[PDB]
Design a protein around this ligand. Structure first.
Ligand SMILES: Nc1ccc(S(=O)(=O)N2CCN(c3ncc(C(O)(C(F)(F)F)C(F)(F)F)cc3-c3cccnc3)CC2)cn1
Ligand SMILES: O=P(O)(O)OC[C@@H](O)[C@@H](O)[C@H](O)[C@@H](O)CO
Length: 585
């Protein structure tokens, strides 16, 4: 029947009370789940939110129990990290025609970028040709843009991979997809396996292979699950690798920008730093080298969230300025400005927020005086600005821009990273009464740029800005339980999430939910057979452009009413959220 082909794989809604015993819950991949810690995220205050998201982030480093899934510290995972380090070593020894590609969509793509930079720096500072590069769904401009739509083509992913791998003789393709989900990566990984004389595919993500995505990809015949399952078979013979520790669900369900992005850094920095630092020692990388780095990254979470009350504040101030109708600027130097841009840009798709709402700036990439003459002008009593720099940066360029901004705002706060017993120029740096001073022990670093110190700092900042940005929006009443209900359906995955959110919140059948969602999307056109049988891309292309699609469909189901009636109901409510909450009653 029409639709059947497209919706066959969707599990039916369970009868109430049997969500567990139906085996529905067991079919939800770890990455897609509701985190139980955050069931009441919507109710928590800023200080609680920082606690709950810190707890959620800590789960990355939690160990395996005694019938269960491998984690970051499990032996099978560190073993794989070791073997991959080795394969990376082979390439570093023979850099003529070698290349290392890091590839993902969205934040996996953004993370790919940073790490390609860092490791390209590392080899530069040793007078080696840079062997790293990146790939992001939608080309290089995707790095600083909200472009959720571009990850759904496998032929695209393969094309971008053919370009960059030229007439190289030996390529390592690290495909990053947190959910083991992105058609962009799946095609890349599959092509790799079809030419193993040249390619070594290494898949990174945070679900068991058995929970890998399995609905059809429009321009490709295999599914992510098939591709991954076949990569796991090749791992015996050491010609593919799958690096897939569980780290537990995201605090905002499906928000893989957060733990997934962090885990991607932790996991990949760790393993690549090990590979480099141990080739010129003439020693194989060993579990023990990896562990040193991981434990350090794990200290970094403790250090970072020991500043929790100061973090909670910056949240409250960021939230205040958006409650009014202000704007928020995240001004940061080098690498950490980038992290800043990336957080701000991610607020657009994640929260359906305007590019002005949380903006990032690097010293998007503006000069000292340029920021001074351009952006400075429209700052205002209500806004918040954030300064993110180390004490190693060039604090004269810093002190200026804050001196100036002080006069227009007064809601400044800052984020400063320091080696132990560095001091903060200007003893009346007040300026910042209540700095977020994050201060780092001395570690023994032998590489010129102190990369471990860099990585730690990036991560700690990421953690702060993610918690700040995410918490700010929750506080504004925009998150339902721990779900972003009102998301813009901008790719198939979000489409599948919308449908799931309707089954879960409504409790009604799969057919009904599907009908209400498709009616909501294509309103005012009615459901025809063509529309039922259409490929998910056609629904995505049309939903991408509307507002409140999911809430409209949810009300049509709760009220057992038409779209015409549910739009009218919503318009005559004080807000979207109250319309939804009161109707969920
Ligand atoms: N490994 C992956 C990744 C993505 C996908 S997906 O794009 O096809 N889609 C992802 C999200 N997804 C779900 N999203 C949300 C839910 C919820 O129930 C939960 F509470 F768990 F978050 C929600 F309440 F939000 F709806 C469930 C799923 C889900 C449901 C059943 C099977 N698989 C995923 C459906 C599958 C499938 N497999
Ligand atoms: O790495 P995945 O599971 O393939 O996810 C890829 C992207 O969709 C993901 O990074 C998304 O853009 C983020 O907004 C999620 O917070």
């Amino acid at each position: 029947m029409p639709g059947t082909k497209r919706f066959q794989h969707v599990i039916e809604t369970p009868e109430p009370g049997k969500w567990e015993l139906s085996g529905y819950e067991a079919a939800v991949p770890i990455t897609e789940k509701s985190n139980p810690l955050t069931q009441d995220l919507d109710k928590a205050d800023a200080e609680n939110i920082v606690r709950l998201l810190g707890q959620c982030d800590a789960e990355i480093f939690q160990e395996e129990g005694q019938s269960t899934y491998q984690r970051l510290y499990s032996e099978s995972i560190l073993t794989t990290m070791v073997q991959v380090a080795g394969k990376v070593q082979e390439v570093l020894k023979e850099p003529d025609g070698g290349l290392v590609v890091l590839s993902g969509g969205g934040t996996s793509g953004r993370m790919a970028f940073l790490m390609s930079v860092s490791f390209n720096q590392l080899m530069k500072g040793l007078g080696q040709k840079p062997l790293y590069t990146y790939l992001i769904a939608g080309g290089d401009r995707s790095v600083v843009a909200s472009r959720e739509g571009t990850e759904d083509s496998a032929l695209h992913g393969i094309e971008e991979l053919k370009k960059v791998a030229a007439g190289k003789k030996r390529v390592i393709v690290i495909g990053i997809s947190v959910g083991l989900s992105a058609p962009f990566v799946a095609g890349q990984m599959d092509c790799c396996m079809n030419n193993t004389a040249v390619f070594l595919p290494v898949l990174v993500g945070f679900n068991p292979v058995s929970m890998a995505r399995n609905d059809p990809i429009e321009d490709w015949s295999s599914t992510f699950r098939q591709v991954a399952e076949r990569m796991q078979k090749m791992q015996e013979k050491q010609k593919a690798f799958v690096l897939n520790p569980a780290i537990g669900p995201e605090g905002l369900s499906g928000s893989s920008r957060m733990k997934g992005g962090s885990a991607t850094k932790i996991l990949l920095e760790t393993l690549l730093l090990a590979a480099h630092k141990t080739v010129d020692q003439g020693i194989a990388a060993s579990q023990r080298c990896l562990l040193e780095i991981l434990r350090t990254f794990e200290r970094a979470h403790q250090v970072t969230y020991s500043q929790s009350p100061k973090i909670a504040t910056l949240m409250k101030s960021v939230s205040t300025s958006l409650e009014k109708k202000g704007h928020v600027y995240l001004v940061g130097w080098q690498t950490l400005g980038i992290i800043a841009i990336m957080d701000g840009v991610e607020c657009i798709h994640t929260f359906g927020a305007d590019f002005r709402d949380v903006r990032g700036f690097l010293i998007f990439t503006f000069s000292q005086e340029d920021f001074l003459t351009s952006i400075l002008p429209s700052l205002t009593e209500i806004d918040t600005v954030v300064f993110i720099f180390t004490l190693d940066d060039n604090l004269t360029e810093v002190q200026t821009i804050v001196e100036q901004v002080k006069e227009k705002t007064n809601h400044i706060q800052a984020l400063a990273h320091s080696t132990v017993g560095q001091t903060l120029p200007i003893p009346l740096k007040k300026l910042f009464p209540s700095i977020i001073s994050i201060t780092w022990p001395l570690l023994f670093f032998e590489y010129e740029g102190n990369f471990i110190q860099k990585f730690q700092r990036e991560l700690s900042t990421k953690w702060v800005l993610n918690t700040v940005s995410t918490g700010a929006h929750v506080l504004l009443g925009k998150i339902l339980q721990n779900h972003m209900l009102d998301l813009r359906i901008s790719n198939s995955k979000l489409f599948w999430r919308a449908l799931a959110m309707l089954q879960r919140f409504s409790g009604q059948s799969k057919a009904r939910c599907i009908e209400s969602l498709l009616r909501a999307i294509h309103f005012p056109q009615p459901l025809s057979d063509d529309i039922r049988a259409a490929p998910i891309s056609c629904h995505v292309q049309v939903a991408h452009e509307k507002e409140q699609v999911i809430p409209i469909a949810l009300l049509s189901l709760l009220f057992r009413c038409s779209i015409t009636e549910a739009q009218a109901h919503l318009a005559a409510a004080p807000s979207v959220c109250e319309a939804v909450r009161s109707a969920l009653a």
